[PDB]
């Protein structure tokens, strides 16, 4: 039975010590600031960040002039600079350890919407993403964790079909107008 062979794995790991005021408050801080649906969402980011940091660490164990090191470091910094997670002149493979979950929650399309305006609230931003309202280039993205890249940031905008800036109004508008006329 092929369709058996399709891989799939996990995206997070629950924290070891379930109940600590300090970690629990730090998690509530991040979930409050970046308007998350639950702390599974926070917990994915640390998993991805831990994977990349471990990738960096294994490289930094080796020495320069090692072809693996040059290639994978170049690739890793390309990946980060494409998502706007490391800045200019900061292409060093040591500032890729210093990145923290602030930086990944900084790129979720909720955050990009709210910081581009167009939301008036970050919790408004999440829902506005989910009611098919914002495209990226020409496709609507209804995922609050879309991780918009820098060569895509310049042109997040409303739909051609959403009521706010696209075409037809919503069903409540059309109800109000139909019972007004």
């Amino acid at each position: 039975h092929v369709n058996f062979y399709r891989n799939y794995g996990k995206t997070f790991k629950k924290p070891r010590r379930p109940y600590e005021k300090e970690r629990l408050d730090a998690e509530l801080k991040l979930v409050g600031e970046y308007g998350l649906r639950c702390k599974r969402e926070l917990w994915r980011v640390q998993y991805a960040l831990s994977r990349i940091r471990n990738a960096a660490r294994h490289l930094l164990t080796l020495d320069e002039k090692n072809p693996r090191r040059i290639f994978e470091g170049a690739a890793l910094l390309r990946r980060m600079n494409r998502y706007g997670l490391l800045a200019e002149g900061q292409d060093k493979l040591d500032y890729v350890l210093a990145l923290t979950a602030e930086n990944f929650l900084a790129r979720r399309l909720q955050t990009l919407v709210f910081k581009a305006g167009m939301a008036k609230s970050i919790h408004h931003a999440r829902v506005l993403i989910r009611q098919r309202h914002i495209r990226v280039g020409r496709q609507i993205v209804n995922v609050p964790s879309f991780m918009v890249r820098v060569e895509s940031e310049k042109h997040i905008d409303f739909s051609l079909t959403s009521p706010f800036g696209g075409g037809p109004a919503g069903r409540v508008k059309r109800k109000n107008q139909k019972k007004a006329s």
Binding site: L28, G32, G35, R37, C38
Partner: protein, 39 residues
């Protein structure tokens, strides 16, 4: 064995209210946020 269920039967029966739903999902964490350390 004659005492099985003793307190379970002793306790009076009391009924709930119709507490308004506290919103689940995102809005619940919104309330936890702006109730704990925005208040």
């Amino acid at each position: 064995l004659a005492r099985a269920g003793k307190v379970r039967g002793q306790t009076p029966k009391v009924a709930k209210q119709d507490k308004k739903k506290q919103p689940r999902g995102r809005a619940h964490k919104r309330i936890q946020y702006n109730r704990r350390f925005v208040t």
